[PDB]
């Protein structure tokens, strides 16, 4: 996915921060959301 610059601390953490971002998918990986590609 790509890195976002928003930090978390689970996976829950990164739905709305990706979709702020366009995207659907992600995780929470080393403190920031990851999404995946549109």
């Given at each position: 996915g790509v890195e976002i610059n928003v930090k978390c601390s689970?996976?829950?953490?990164?739905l709305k921060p990706c979709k702020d971002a366009g995207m659907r998918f992600g995780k929470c990986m080393n403190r920031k959301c990851h999404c995946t590609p549109k």
């Open positions: 689970g996976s829950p953490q990164c």
